[PDB]
A paper describes a structure:
A [name], [name], is first shown to be indispensable for pathogen-inducible pterostilbene (3,5-bis-O-methylated) biosynthesis in sorghum ([name]). Phylogenetic analysis indicates the recruitment of genus-specific SOMTs from canonical caffeic acid O-methyltransferases (COMTs) after the divergence of Sorghum spp. from Saccharum spp. In recombinant enzyme assays, [name] and COMTs regioselectively catalyze O-methylation of stilbene A-ring and B-ring respectively. Whilst [name] shows global structural resemblance to SbCOMT, molecular characterizations illustrate two hydrophobic residues (Ile144/Phe337) crucial for substrate binding orientation leading to 3,5-bis-O-methylations in the A-ring. The catalytic residues of [name] are highly conserved with all reported COMTs, including His282 as the key nucleophile, whereas Asp283, Glu310, and Glu342 collectively charge the basicity or confine His282 in its reactive conformation.
To rationalize their different catalytic regioselectivities, structural analyses involving X-ray crystallography and computational methods were conducted. We solved the crystal structure of an [name]-resveratrol-nicotinamide adenine dinucleotide (β-NAD) ternary complex (diffracted to 1.72 Å resolution, Fig. 4d; β-NAD was utilized as an additive to improve crystallization), an [name]-resveratrol binary complex, and two ternary complexes reproduced with pinostilbene or pterostilbene (diffracted at 2.10 and 2.56 Å, respectively). All complexes were in high structural resemblance and depicted as a homodimer with an open conformation. Of the three hydroxyl groups on resveratrol capable of forming hydrogen bonds, only the methyl-accepting 3-OH group (A-ring) formed direct hydrogen bonds to [name] residues, including the catalytic residues His282 (2.80 Å) and Asp283 (3.26 Å). The same binding mode was adopted for pinostilbene or pterostilbene in the corresponding [name] co-crystals. Overall, these structures depicted a productive substrate orientation within the substrate binding pocket which greatly favors A-ring O-methylation. Meanwhile, [name] also showed strong binding affinities towards resveratrol and pinostilbene (4.69 μM and 2.86 μM respectively) but a higher Kd to pterostilbene (11.20 μM), demonstrating [name] favors its substrates over product for binding.
Residue numbers in the entry:
A (entry chain B), B (entry chain A): 15 to 377
Amino acid sequence: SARNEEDESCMFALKLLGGFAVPFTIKAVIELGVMDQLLTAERAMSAEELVAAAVAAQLPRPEVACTMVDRLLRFLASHSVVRCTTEVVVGTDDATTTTCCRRSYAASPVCKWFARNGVEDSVLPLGMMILNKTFLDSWQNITDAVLEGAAPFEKTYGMPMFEYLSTNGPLNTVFHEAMANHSMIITKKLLKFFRGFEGLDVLVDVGGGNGTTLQMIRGQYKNMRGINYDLPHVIAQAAPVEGVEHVGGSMFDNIPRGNAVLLKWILHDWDDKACIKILKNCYTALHVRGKVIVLEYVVPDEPEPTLAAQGAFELDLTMLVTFGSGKERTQREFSELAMEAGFSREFKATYIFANVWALEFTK
Amino acid sequence: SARNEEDESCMFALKLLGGFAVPFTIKAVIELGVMDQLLTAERAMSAEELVAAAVAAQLPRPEVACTMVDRLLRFLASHSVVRCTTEVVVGTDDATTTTCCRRSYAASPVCKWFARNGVEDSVLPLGMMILNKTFLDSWQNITDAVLEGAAPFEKTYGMPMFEYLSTNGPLNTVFHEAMANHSMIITKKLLKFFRGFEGLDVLVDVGGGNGTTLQMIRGQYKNMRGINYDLPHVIAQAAPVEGVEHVGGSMFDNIPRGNAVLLKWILHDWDDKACIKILKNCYTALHVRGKVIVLEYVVPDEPEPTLAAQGAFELDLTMLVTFGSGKERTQREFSELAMEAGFSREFKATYIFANVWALEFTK
Ligand SMILES: NC(=O)c1ccc[n+]([C@@H]2O[C@H](COP(=O)([O-])OP(=O)(O)OC[C@H]3O[C@@H](n4cnc5c(N)ncnc54)[C@H](O)[C@@H]3O)[C@@H](O)[C@H]2O)c1
Ligand SMILES: NC(=O)c1ccc[n+]([C@@H]2O[C@H](COP(=O)([O-])OP(=O)(O)OC[C@H]3O[C@@H](n4cnc5c(N)ncnc54)[C@H](O)[C@@H]3O)[C@@H](O)[C@H]2O)c1
Ligand SMILES: COc1cc(/C=C/c2ccc(O)cc2)cc(OC)c1
Ligand SMILES: COc1cc(/C=C/c2ccc(O)cc2)cc(OC)c1
């Protein structure tokens, strides 16, 4: 900047307004198959090489497609998402957006999180939900929804998100693969780092889906039995799981009895009154010394400008947009709810991965 | 210590995919009138005071509205866009998203760029274009546009952007206000920092609109005659201006004769062959020792990870999305075009403001 500091203020303002460009560009680079080619490459590749390898079809305008991809990747290079090298061309190049010199690109480490295959410890499924147009369009109606005290999503589509999925099979698939992708990674990391399944006879997984989380947990605690508690329609679609009883119900009526209850990414959908109802049912269903295991992000007590804190408040806003009064909570807030619900002044927190903690409350 | 690394990398991937949240939250805080309250406030104010000052209307759910705005502001505070202080509540609170303690917010300096009339000059009209739904939607169709070698805009709406604006008066207004806003800031900055208007008898402003740029330029260089040259339909609606001749025409036919020709944000709309045609007309229009003055961003010849270079590549992708073959160019590329068009190996560059340079080529 011309110093000024005024100039840098101005450019900073523009950066803030333009923060959508990176996500949308990475999505394009993924969809085009360019990202997968960067992830399987032995060396830096030009846009021309990356297009020829990603795309089988004959392209109507092959030179234009190549210079556009170059421009995509050059921008991602300025944000450190890919590495760029520039070399002089012996002649002239028709597939670069510069005609002295060719740029070649390689994946930065972070790009492994966008892989379509591998062992599928990627966040791509969750990424195509985050950048799904149907979900993104809600973010344009925040203002009106705040004024009405409503969820932006419901102001955009006229019903709650979970109801809307019922009318939209493709979005419903994107949503379920994202949730399953996330649950897969957290469950593996939970089994690596968390010790609070040891000694449990019966684990109730509230929102257990097809019961895969209980299966994977039981793979490690063979003597443990599980209750996959989920809505009657979700229970129905579930194949039998050795050691696991599938039970249908609403967590608002009742939760099955067990030594521990697992709530993964449940309470953040709901406001305090609903969360105190879920936790009171957790209470009545446990014996003394039984616990709730809450798998959730935890927002700091004050808005720190760190990578973790930003991530957390960003998930908060995603809950705002999605559900309105669903929210991300501090540890203190999780504690207050657990205490309102009758749980004791005995709190454990174990950091798992990607801002998810396992918080444990004891009856 | 490679768990830390895997975790950091994963969070960085999520940050990259979630970078739309900031722009969209800023838009909400502005549209709600909260940003202007921040900009005129004496001290830090709570979301509840900010909503009470910004909203005249009566609200159906005022507590919910307040806690939602708190959540928006807390997130912007984690991005350093606003300042936040936290104080214990010695009473009874449900208008922050925590009951123990109230957050109060103040504007960071960067927020003056988001003024409606809050604090001064601002890039709000430009940002309302940037975050306009119609323009943003195009970013979702980059993948297919690349494959067909087309502008994402054309692939989303079935025709080019200038065509489409003719059929959408509200968006045509948004587009024109953004360009007037940016032209106004840059003209003022040009008169502070640029010295290439001195000694000119006749300056031709190609695309001059209603002729404000020459008026303000004449406001400083009294003996300068302007020619405000633009499309016949734009010249129709222009009130007279002392010392400025309004001439309708197209720049691809002819340019009026002059000592200098000003091209502000014209060449970046067009591919090389179109830019060389514009500049060859600029050539023929000038006497020897006359100048073309180009007002443009200038990309670095390599993708540096600085605020400035990211800004410039961000504008290049905006041109890609909007026009396809519109592009930002390096200094060498601007030079190659000018020399193709007959200009001397005699090149000047003066940095203006918000990434804009005034480059001058001589005959
Ligand atoms: N604060 C609140 O908004 C609040 C508070 C208390 C109760 N509620 C409940 O919300 C209901 C909304 O009506 P409805 O007819 O759409 O709901 P419903 O008849 O399906 O009630 C069951 C509820 O369980 C939820 N649920 C989500 N995951 C679950 C899981 N794994 N297992 C069990 N239940 C799960 C569903 O979203 C659903 O809202 C009200 O009837 C009320 O009982 C809301
Ligand atoms: N790449 C090219 O140069 C290209 C493509 C097709 C045709 N052509 C030829 O070049 C000309 C371009 O076609 P057209 O008849 O649509 O021309 P035009 O006068 O409509 O110019 C096209 C665009 O340039 C801009 N423009 C032109 N002069 C301007 C001025 N004085 N101020 C501000 N904006 C201005 C406007 O946005 C306009 O939509 C024709 O004479 C045609 O034969 C050129
Ligand atoms: C004709 O000049 C233009 C400039 C612009 C600049 C937009 C822009 C976007 C983001 C920024 O940070 C700065 C400018 C856009 C245009 O068509 C939509 C045309
Ligand atoms: C029920 O749990 C949900 C989790 C989420 C998680 C989304 C997300 C967004 C960005 C990230 O960086 C991580 C997760 C979204 C939901 O509705 C859209 C529901």
